[PDB]
């Protein structure tokens, strides 16, 4: 009982782009760019779409870096998130009614104001590792258990 989602991190050698979500999903946390894959769309197309729609950036190459399955206790649908990274972008990120984009130096990532699972996988992302992960959450703030392993093939 899963539903497909994309998540894109715009990661250049000195810095990463995150957006503060002003409302709705993930509000009040620094998020990457992503959402539900639509009907007739490949996962990679959906990721490019979500980045563009949400960030204002246009991406050339996307690289798949991970898959994370989220379980929220009591919610029937598992969220199957396909995670991608790019360093080849065009444009300037645009602040909108839904999000406030900001660049962070890699040693100043705001983990305290991010989803708590990010402290586990973001360091793999930053070191160019690919991963499979699973996080069981109670509410949005508590990780009950998780697994996370590095893989050769996402
Ligand atoms: C940078 N880390 C995270 N960024 C986001 N959500 C994040 C990030 N880390 C995280 O746990 N989430 C929540 C989450 C949970 C289930 C499905 C999800 C996201 O779909 C991926 C699309 O989410 C876009 C919002 O960005």
Q: Where are the domains of the chain?
A: 1-154
For residues 63 and 129, the answer to whether their CB atoms sit within 8 Å is no
Question: For atom 3 of ligand 1, which residue has the closest CA?
Answer: 31
What's this structure's resolution in Å?
1.8
The alpha carbon of 91 and the centre of ligand 1 are apart by a number of angstroms equal to 23
Q: Return the exposure string of 9-37: e unless at least 16 CB atoms fall within 10 Å of the residue's CB, then b.
A: bbbeeeebbbbbbeeeebeebbbbbbbeb
In DSSP notation, 136-151 reads EEETTTEEEEEEEEEE
Q: Of 5, 99, 103, whose CA–CA distance to 49 is shortest?
A: 5
Question: For atom 6 of ligand 1, which residue has the closest CA?
Answer: 31
Is 1-154 CATH 3.90.79.10? yes
* Angle at the Cα of 64 from the Cα atoms of 57 and 128, rounded to 5 degrees: 100
């Amino acid at each position: 009982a899963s539903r497909l989602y994309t998540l894109v991190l715009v990661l250049q050698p000195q810095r990463v782009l995150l957006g503060m979500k002003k409302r709705g999903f993930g509000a009040g946390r620094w998020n990457g760019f992503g959402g539900k894959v639509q009907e007739g769309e490949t996962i990679e197309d959906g990721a490019r779409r979500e980045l563009q729609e949400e960030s204002g950036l246009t991406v050339d190459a996307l690289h798949k870096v991970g898959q994370i399955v989220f379980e929220f206790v009591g919610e029937p649908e598992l969220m199957d998130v396909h995670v991608f990274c790019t360093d080849s972008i065009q444009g300037t990120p645009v602040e909108s009614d839904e999000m406030r984009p900001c660049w962070f130096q890699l040693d100043q990532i705001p983990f305290k104001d991010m989803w708590p699972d990010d402290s586990y996988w973001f360091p793999l992302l930053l070191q160019k590792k690919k991963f499979h992960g699973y996080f069981k959450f109670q509410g949005q703030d508590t990780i009950l258990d998780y697994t996370l392993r590095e893989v050769d093939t996402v």
